[PDB]
């Protein structure tokens, strides 16, 4: 196969490894700097230009679209899709997963385990919002469009009140979540490819091997399928009400998971493209 990797930096561990794994398995691997691709959309036949020349004969594309360039990256990927090139992950699914508010509402609607969660921007009744999500301690996440800006522990009602008062008029979107103290600063990263968790690790605030529960395994797989992603990193907290999904990432890192498990994750991703493109 001829496989495009949409990555802004070919020296990054994950991009290098995907290129390496592809070449081991007899594929032509080309790294395309997403922002240096330019396109004619209107006209007789869809094409993508790159450094003065058209891009031709691509069988598949691996999108590694950073969150800061979601809109443009999805436009380049969408163009590849319209030209019949097989995407590892679909443009609509990547866009959906980068909208954190939409992602949580979808996972919630489909009965995926989540921390008790609230949304606000400029709420008139902050105490009501704090009560809704079960009171302090709670975590406040700050969102600007398709990017997470900060994550903050508010140990007391007054700390939550002060952060919300501060951010009111700063034009960020605000997530308020119950603090999962019982996790003791640990989370599970489940690497999902198709309908399988192919690898997992415990991250402590260091990384270690972990045996995930059948419920955690099913939750990770379902979260990816619900998002419409074939390849996803799913982050899970072990809470007193079972596994809670924190994050569904359309472009998960390979360094942490590969160095901890010793598994050829890049290879398994290439295998997925072989079997489905």
């Amino acid at each position: 196969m001829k496989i495009a990797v949409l990555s802004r930096n070919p020296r990054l561990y994950s991009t290098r490894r995907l290129v390496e794994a592809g070449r081991e398995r007899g594929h032509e691997m080309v790294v395309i700097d997403t922002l240096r691709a330019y396109m004619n959309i209107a006209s007789h036949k869809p094409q993508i230009h790159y450094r003065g020349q058209p891009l031709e004969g691509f069988d598949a594309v691996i999108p590694r679209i950073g969150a800061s360039v979601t809109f443009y990256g999805c436009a380049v990927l969408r163009q590849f899709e319209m030209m019949g090139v097989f995407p590892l992950n679909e443009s609509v699914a990547i866009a959906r997963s980068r909208d954190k508010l939409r992602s949580l509402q979808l996972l919630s609607r489909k009965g995926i385990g989540l921390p008790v969660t609230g949304f606000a921007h400029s709420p008139d009744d902050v105490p009501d919002l704090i009560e809704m999500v079960g009171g302090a301690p709670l975590v406040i996440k700050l969102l600007e469009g398709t990017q997470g800006i900060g994550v903050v522990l508010c140990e007391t009602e007054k700390a939550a009140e002060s952060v919300l008062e501060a951010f009111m008029g700063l034009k960020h979107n605000i997530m308020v979540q119950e603090y999962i103290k019982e996790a003791g600063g640990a989370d599970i990263r489940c690497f999902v490819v198709g309908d399988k968790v192919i690898a997992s690790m415990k991250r402590q605030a260091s990384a270690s091997l972990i045996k995930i529960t059948p419920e955690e395994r099913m939750t990770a797989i379902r979260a990816a399928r619900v998002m419409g992603l074939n390849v996803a990193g799913v982050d899970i907290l072990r809470s007193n009400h079972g596994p809670l999904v924190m994050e569904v990432n359309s472009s998960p890192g390979l360094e942490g998971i590969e160095s901890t498990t010793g598994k050829d994750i890049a290879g398994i991703i290439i295998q997925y493209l072989e079997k489905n493109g």
């Binding site: 990555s7 802004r8 950073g66 969150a67 990193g233 994050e247 472009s251 890192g253």
Partner: peptide
Amino acid sequence: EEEEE
């Protein structure tokens, strides 16, 4: 940093 979240 970003393409590996």
